[PDB]
Design an enzyme around this catalytic site. Structure first.
Site, PDB file in Angstrom:
ATOM      1  N   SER B 119       0.838  -1.197   0.000  1.00 34.71           N
ATOM      2  CA  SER B 119       0.000   0.000   0.000  1.00 34.71           C
ATOM      3  C   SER B 119       0.877   1.253   0.000  1.00 34.71           C
ATOM      4  CB  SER B 119      -0.925   0.002   1.217  1.00 34.71           C
ATOM      5  OG  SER B 119      -1.675   1.200   1.295  1.00 34.71           O
ATOM      6  N   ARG B 120       0.758   2.071  -1.040  1.00 32.10           N
ATOM      7  CA  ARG B 120       1.643   3.225  -1.192  1.00 32.10           C
ATOM      8  C   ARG B 120       1.353   4.324  -0.176  1.00 32.10           C
ATOM      9  NH1 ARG B 120       2.767   4.867  -7.288  1.00 32.10           N
ATOM     10  NH2 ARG B 120       4.650   5.557  -6.166  1.00 32.10           N
TER      11      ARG B 120
END
Lengths: 59, 255, 214, 132, 119, 116, 127
Positions: B119-120
């Site tokens: 998850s960025r």
């Protein structure tokens, strides 16, 4: 109580005393090092002149 | 959903699945005799999904602070994330929740491959109450996947690596969550905190399941005041960290 | 060669790498664990061998041959190097019977001379050997083998010169009959009543064997 | 050369190695023996008994399983055995009687196994005298 | 065999089987080595490798490449040659002596020349 | 669970996990043997092999292929069979006693007919 | 007829390849895994047949019979070759009556098995 008569080799004569001693102590001060030190799973087999063999048995 | 977004609210939309959509669109495009590309997909196929996912976002305070979340679903063919369609989608989104059938068979359900799943945004959108106990959980699991081959060998493993195996087995067993059974953050933190520190290492890897049950019910009857403070504050003060630890060690003891 | 055949094959090689790469590190642990059983067997060995030094006990003027090996594989060239040394010493005295300790080494010599073999041992390569097991093995060599009658007995073991090199080693085992004819024996007081020479053979044969395996 | 270098080692652990000792008492087949600084080279078989290494300071006493003892001409005694046993804080009376009694029942069992029982009786009885 | 003769058929087949067994273990060789190969398998490899090298033949036309004078071998001698190698009558000779060799006699000749070159 | 029953689900899940680890250790059972496996592993592996062969069933339709008369097992007995095998109540019976067999009773009957 | 003598033969050859691949490890084999390995290796050698050499049914049954049972186990591999031809010539000379029953009947009776059994063992003893 003869050991060299109908008993076993001198190696075994001291062996029985090694396990008896190691097993005559406290159960608390008995590391696993000593447990497996008295444990063995080896079997011997007598062979003939023609690759033949005898019934397997425990050491 | 944008309606909700524009008017200053929150809307969650799940596309299940984009894979089927592309197939449909491919059909129209081919029948209309438009140029066929990789795997029989027209060049505008990427422009399709990019012009869809970019519609969801987080409006600023001036716009209404409204927001639209997107959870697009893509079906791969034998783990082939290198395919055309998937490559397009994966390039546009902001993270993946990769799932593997294999992990499913072992029992790990939901089978979310921690190794790939990313998850960025990360902590930017995670409750600090859980962030304080999750920052480390990614570490142990990380070293666990590296020393996972050793678990197959005899006890000849040194104590250092062995410790990792003790945690991983249990940390992985905790993530196993039955379907249709979501838990609030107030119930997650207590389980993660007991796992990270290692208060389960002494417990059998077979009783980890019932551990969650009996533990939650305990707090909700003796330490209910702690749970409710985490739900409202959303954080864990030095006082709570100590109060939570004391309540855990107490239950683990009586167990 | 389809994408699937290469993807499936490439994946199974990767598994092998993980199995071998971990086998090495695990090996480094059993290595240090066998050092405690190696040093404690050499220091003790020097205690009993010190006697033979100050007191010449050489052999002057049928032979028993024992080869110390394991039963596991994937160890490089250990069942080939030893099976080659015994082979050379066998060309000089083919009559000399052999009693290898290891089903693995057995098959090595069982092809060249299936006659000489008259006894084999299995289940030792597992963990580090102890005197409890060593003395027991030497015991059968005196009961069904009768090593006491054999004039000269030889032992074959692998002496680790380094972590990257090994050297096959051989060491004779002098029997009771060779203890008397020892040039330097009179210097040591002894009573010909407790079969001291007799009980020394049944014991030396055990320790030397233990220092060979360990 | 003053004193005598003792080398008491086992197939699992080495205690003394080239260490100078004042006096040692180890049971021999012929009978109990003692050794000091300069001693005549003797090679005797050690029987399951009790050894005691003496020093200027208080001397420690350990129980031995058995083996050989040789006093080198150069004033160097070498003790070789299998297992060792500390003073008394290691062995327990209760842990001994359990097997000890079971040994008398081994004579009752088949002789093949009773043969080793006779050998145990002796070693066990000596364990009791160690209690002192 | 109803054309090249029964013996010729058998010798050829044996050469194939031997070469084939070397190929089927090739994967093992690169990974583990010959140390892991069984006694029977390890003997077939060497023999095989000897047969392969022996297959090479200096070409008169390609002398400007090999620098070695052409070698013309008759069918009659070739059969006997390999057959002799199969029987294990040249397992002492080094493999190099089989490389770019014409007649089977030239093998033993070349093997002897390598003894003087060893220092 | 809310369909086939709680008991039914658990037994089914155990069987799946057993067959999975088995297939996971396939790289060790050929590269290091069966002896290298742990006590918990060997015991599982044996079972996984018994259950695997226990899944086979002779159909009355393909009786001309197997030579053995078709066998129809009831779901109520099926679950009760593997359950018993998962508990280790038949760790003595030979694997070949589970190959091409219908009901659990037949396993014991077969294992006894072979011993003769 | 041929259906009886070879029942699980295909299944057995499956076990052979199963054991043949597992003995690649270079580990010793017990009596079971080596017994089947010995027979499985010879059955594969018995199946080898030369081109342009069709064999009747009365000649296939006997060979397969001596294979599935285990009478070839005690014979060297490079011997299976000439064994086939020799065994056939044996029956065509002596026990030819049996070949004639198998041919016509096409099945094996309680009596035909008895004679066929004794004809096999008698030949193994020869040479």
């Amino acid at each position: 109580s003869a050991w060299r008569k109908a008993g076993i080799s001198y190696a075994a004569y001291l062996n029985v005393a090694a396990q008896a001693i190691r097993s005559s102590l406290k159960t608390e001060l008995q590391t696993a090092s000593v447990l497996n030190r008295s444990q063995t799973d080896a079997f011997y087999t007598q062979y003939k002149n023609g690759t033949a063999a005898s019934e397997p048995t425990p050491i | 959903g944008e309606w909700f977004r524009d008017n200053g609210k929150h809307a969650l939309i799940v596309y299940d699945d984009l894979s089927k959509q592309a197939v449909a669109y491919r059909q129209l495009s081919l029948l209309l005799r438009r140029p066929p590309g990789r795997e029989a997909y027209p060049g505008d196929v990427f422009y399709l999904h990019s012009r869809l996912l970019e519609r969801a976002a987080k409006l600023s305070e001036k716009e209404g602070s409204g927001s639209l979340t997107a959870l697009p679903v893509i079906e791969t063919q034998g783990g082939d994330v290198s395919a055309y369609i998937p490559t397009n989608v994966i390039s546009i989104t902001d993270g993946q929740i990769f799932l593997e059938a294999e992990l499913f068979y072992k029992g790990i359900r939901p089978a979310i491959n921690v190794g790939l799943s990313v998850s960025r945004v990360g902590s930017a959108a995670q409750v600090k109450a859980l962030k304080q106990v999750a920052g480390s959980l990614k570490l142990f699991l990380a070293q666990y996947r590296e020393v996972a081959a050793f678990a197959q060998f005899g006890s000849d493993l040194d104590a250092s690596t062995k410790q990792t195996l003790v945690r991983g087995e249990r940390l992985t067993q905790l993530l196993k969550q039955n379907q249709y059974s979501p838990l609030a953050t107030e119930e997650q933190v207590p389980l993660i905190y007991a796992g990270v520190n290692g208060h389960l290492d002494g417990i059998e890897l077979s009783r980890i399941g019932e551990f969650e049950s009996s533990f939650l019910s305990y707090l909700k009857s003796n330490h209910n005041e702690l749970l409710t403070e985490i739900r409202e504050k959303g954080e864990l003060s030095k006082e709570l960290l100590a109060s939570l630890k004391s309540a855990t060690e107490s239950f683990v003891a009586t167990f | 060669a389809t994408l699937k055949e290469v993807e499936m094959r490439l994946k199974s090689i990767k598994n092998i790498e993980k199995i071998t790469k971990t086998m090495k590190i695990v090996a480094s642990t059993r290595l240090s664990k066998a050092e405690k059983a190696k040093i404690s067997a050499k220091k003790m060995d020097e205690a009993e061998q010190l006697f033979y030094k100050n007191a010449e006990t050489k052999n002057l003027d049928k032979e028993l041959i024992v080869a110390i090996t394991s039963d596991k594989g994937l160890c490089g060239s250990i069942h080939s190097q030893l099976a080659k040394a015994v082979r050379r010493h066998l060309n000089d005295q083919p009559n000399a019977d052999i009693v290898t300790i290891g089903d693995k080494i057995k098959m090595q010599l069982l092809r060249t001379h299936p006659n000489n073999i008259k006894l084999s041992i299995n289940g030792i390569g597992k963990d580090a050997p102890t005197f409890q097991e060593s003395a027991l093995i030497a015991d059968k060599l005196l009961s069904v083998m009768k090593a006491g009658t054999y004039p000269k007995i030889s032992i074959f073991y692998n002496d680790p010169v380094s972590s990257l090199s090994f050297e096959p080693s051989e060491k004779p085992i002098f029997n009771a009959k060779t203890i008397e004819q020892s040039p330097s024996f009179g210097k040591f007081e002894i009573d010909t009543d407790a079969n001291v020479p007799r009980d020394l053979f049944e014991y030396t044969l055990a320790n030397q064997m233990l220092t060979a395996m360990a | 050369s003053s004193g005598l270098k003792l080398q008491f080692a086992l197939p699992h652990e080495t205690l003394y190695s080239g260490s100078e000792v004042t006096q040692v008492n180890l049971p021999a087949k012929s009978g109990r023996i003692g050794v000091l600084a300069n001693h005549v080279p003797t090679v005797e078989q050690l029987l399951p008994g009790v050894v005691e290494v003496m020093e200027g300071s208080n001397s420690k006493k350990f129980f031995i399983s058995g083996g050989f003892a040789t006093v080198q001409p150069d004033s160097q005694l070498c003790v070789t055995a299998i297992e060792a046993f500390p003073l008394e804080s290691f062995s327990q009376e209760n842990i001994k009687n359990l097997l000890a009694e079971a040994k008398k029942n081994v004579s009752s069992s088949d002789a093949r196994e009773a043969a080793e029982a006779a050998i145990q009786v002796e070693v066990l009885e000596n364990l009791q005298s160690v209690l002192k | 065999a109803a054309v090249v003769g029964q013996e010729h058929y058998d010798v050829a087949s044996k050469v194939q089987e031997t070469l084939q067994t070397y190929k089927s273990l090739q994967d093992i060789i690169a990974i583990l080595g010959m140390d892991e190969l069984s006694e029977q398998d390890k003997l077939t490899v060497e023999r095989a490798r000897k047969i392969q090298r022996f297959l090479s033949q200096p070409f008169a036309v390609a002398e400007v490449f090999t620098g070695i004078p052409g070698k013309l071998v008759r069918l009659k001698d070739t059969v006997a040659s390999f057959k002799a190698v199969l029987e294990g009558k040249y397992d002492n000779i080094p493999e190099h002596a089989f490389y770019m060799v014409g007649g089977i006699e030239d093998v033993v000749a070349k093997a002897e020349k390598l003894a003087a070159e060893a220092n």
